[PDB]
Amino acid sequence: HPETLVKVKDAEDQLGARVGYIELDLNSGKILESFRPEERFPMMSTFKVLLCGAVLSRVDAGQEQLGRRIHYSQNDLVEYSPVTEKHLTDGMTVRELCSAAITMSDNTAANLLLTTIGGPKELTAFLHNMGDHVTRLDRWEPELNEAIPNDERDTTTPAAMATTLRKLLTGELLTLASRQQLIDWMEADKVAGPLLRSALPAGWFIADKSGAGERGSRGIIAALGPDGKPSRIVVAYTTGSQATMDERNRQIAEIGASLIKHW
Ligand SMILES: [Xe]
Ligand SMILES: [Xe]
Ligand SMILES: [Xe]
């Protein structure tokens, strides 16, 4: 809706930075709203959903099992590992690692999962093979959050990310079981409280994944809808701002409010 696009424009002015935005109808795949749809933004932790999509694709092919247990060492633990730091002795299953990566944004969980698929290059190869020739992961946590201006590493475009997320959640790629699992993990996100969720009326469904990185990078991907069922995909990214986290949160929440208001 035009008023939502105005909020996005206002966010650009107030943050002093680019904002990319897409609204995508879940069923029809029609683009309902867009802004800088073909521009690149760092994915940050939003890549963790694509990562577990690749993992689930391997589970489908029998190349991976959700119950397989991975052990690791203190040396594997990078910054912000709230779940993995608690399981050096017992290890974690692949399912537990995806839950940690998506619901808590656990960085070590993401790196371990990357190792299972062969690293950033293979995540990118996975994306390429499902028809996203735009999105690219090049680095591991936490370096992938560097967000150097004009650097294309570890970036997506709002349009590429939106359509890929749609293909993962509803497309032909994953089995029904794996699509449900991916969405269930996203619905259980615990670290996107002040963003879109903050504008969400009671009874609405939301499954999401947020990200933040260097140089004012912030973003979120989401499938949401009223009446406990998703009906739309929303992607929003920003980078370049010197604004505090709180202001970036509030800008996304404000865009969120307009989306809901004019649903
Ligand atoms: Xe969904
Ligand atoms: Xe934003
Ligand atoms: Xe949003």
UniProtKB/Swiss-Prot annotation:
InterPro entries according to UniProt: Beta-lactam/transpept-like, Beta-lactam_cat, Beta-lactam_class-A, Beta-lactam_class-A_AS
Keywords tagged on the record: Antibiotic resistance, Disulfide bond, Hydrolase, Plasmid, Signal, Transposable element
Domain of life, source organism: Bacteria
Active-site residues (renumbered): S45 (acyl-ester intermediate), E143 (proton acceptor)
Pfam families found in the cross-reference section: Beta-lactamase2 (PF13354)
Disulfide bond sites: C52-C98
A Gene Ontology BP annotation from the UniProt entry: response to antibiotic
Hydrolase in keyword set: yes
Effect of E79K: In TEM-3, TEM-4, TEM-6, TEM-8, TEM-16 and TEM-24
Reactions catalysed according to its record: a beta-lactam + H2O = a substituted beta-amino acid
Molecular-function annotations in GO: beta-lactamase activity
Positions contributing to substrate binding: K209, S210, G211
Outcome of swapping Q14K: In TEM-2, TEM-3, TEM-8, TEM-16 and TEM-24
EC number: 3.5.2.6
Biotech and industrial use: This protein is used as a marker in many commonly used cloning vectors, such as pBR322 and the pUC series.
Reported function: TEM-type are the most prevalent beta-lactamases in enterobacteria; they hydrolyze the beta-lactam bond in susceptible beta-lactam antibiotics, thus conferring resistance to penicillins and cephalosporins. TEM-3 and TEM-4 are capable of hydrolyzing cefotaxime and ceftazidime. TEM-5 is capable of hydrolyzing ceftazidime. TEM-6 is capable of hydrolyzing ceftazidime and aztreonam. TEM-8/CAZ-2, TEM-16/CAZ-7 and TEM-24/CAZ-6 are markedly active against ceftazidime. IRT-4 shows resistance to beta-lactamase inhibitors.
Extra remark beyond the main annotation: The beta-lactamase present on pBR322 was cloned from plasmid R1 (R7268). The class A beta-lactamase family has a specific amino-acid numbering system, sometimes called Ambler or ABL numbering and often misspelt as Amber. A multiple sequence alignment was used to derive a consensus sequence and then the consensus was numbered taking into account insertions and deletions. This allows use of identical numbers, e.g. for active site residues, despite differences in protein length. UniProt always uses natural numbering of residues, hence there appear to be differences in numbering between this entry and some papers.
Entry similarity comment: Belongs to the class-A beta-lactamase family.
Name of this protein: Beta-lactamase TEM
Species in which this protein is naturally found: Escherichia coli
Gene of this entry: bla
